[PDB]
């Protein structure tokens, strides 16, 4: 029943005022960051021709314990400022600036939400952060900058106490998510609109958050395809804007009448 224009009018008329957002790697491929579960001829093609058996192994603990070097090549590549946010991030920034953003839940570890100017208090980086690290042998914690010099020098960082490999607090497969993830217990019942951008919804427990909003809440998917619970268990007020994520965001921006703000924001930032 609901269209993208309907959602735009709900926002314009302040009928939807507390927006929660879920994003994955699909919002950052337009910035040049390949999706580790849908890679191309760039970073992951080169590592797979050196010592990476498959891309998901970068985030698997058994492989890391065997050869941590592929992961740290990726860590070096994701140093903030190596990539710039694209229109998708700055749209989320605009949501925040206009007082509509309750929380932005991201599966990405590229830090582009923060680079776009969204405050940390609005963010839940559900798949971890490079801001801290943990020795894989003795479990001592370390500030993330204590290993940066090593990573940028193509050195595997090691613990000063036991010499084990120190791993950034990125959430690997088989690991729990940060406790800040549990903000969803209150954030999602309180949302009156859910936006889902650029994700496959194939990674749990993050994906199941799409079911945590109330049945009254529209769920707007801006993605190349209809995916996850949105595809198998649709709700009456779901909306799918399918295609290039940038074109879908730009279409919503135009329907919101935010084109001029977006242009102002981008030039002031870029």
């Amino acid at each position: 029943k609901l269209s993208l224009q309907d959602v735009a009018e709900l926002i314009r008329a302040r009928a939807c005022q507390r927006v929660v957002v879920m994003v994955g790697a699909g919002i950052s491929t337009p910035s040049g960051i390949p999706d580790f579960r849908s890679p191309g001829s760039g970073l992951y093609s080169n590592l797979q021709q050196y010592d990476l058996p498959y891309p998901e192994a970068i985030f698997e603990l058994p492989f890391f314990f065997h050869n941590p070097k592929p992961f740290f090549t990726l860590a070096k590549e994701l140093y903030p400022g190596n990539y710039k946010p694209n229109v998708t991030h700055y749209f989320l920034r605009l949501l925040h600036d206009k007082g509509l953003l309750l929380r932005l839940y991201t599966q990405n570890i590229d830090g582009l939400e923060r680079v776009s100017g969204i405050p940390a208090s609005k963010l839940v980086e559900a798949h971890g952060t490079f801001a801290s690290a943990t020795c894989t042998v003795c479990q001592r914690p370390f500030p993330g900058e204590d290993i940066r010099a090593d990573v940028m020098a193509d050195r595997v960082p090691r613990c000063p106490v036991c010499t084990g490999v120190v791993k950034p607090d990125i959430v690997f497969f088989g690991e729990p998510l940060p406790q800040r993830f549990l903000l969803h217990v209150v954030d999602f019942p309180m949302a009156d609109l859910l936006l889902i951008l650029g994700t496959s919804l194939e990674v749990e427990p993050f994906a199941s958050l799409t079911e945590a909003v109330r049945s009254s809440v529209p769920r707007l998917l801006i993605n190349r395809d209809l995916v996850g619970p949105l595809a198998w268990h649709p709700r009456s007020r779901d909306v799918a804007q399918l295609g290039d994520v940038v074109h879908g965001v730009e279409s919503l921006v135009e329907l919101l009448g935010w084109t001029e703000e977006m242009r102002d924001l981008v030039q002031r930032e870029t």
Partner: peptide
């Protein structure tokens, strides 16, 4: 509770 792919 832990990160997994379907």
């Amino acid at each position: 509770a832990t990160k997994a792919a379907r």
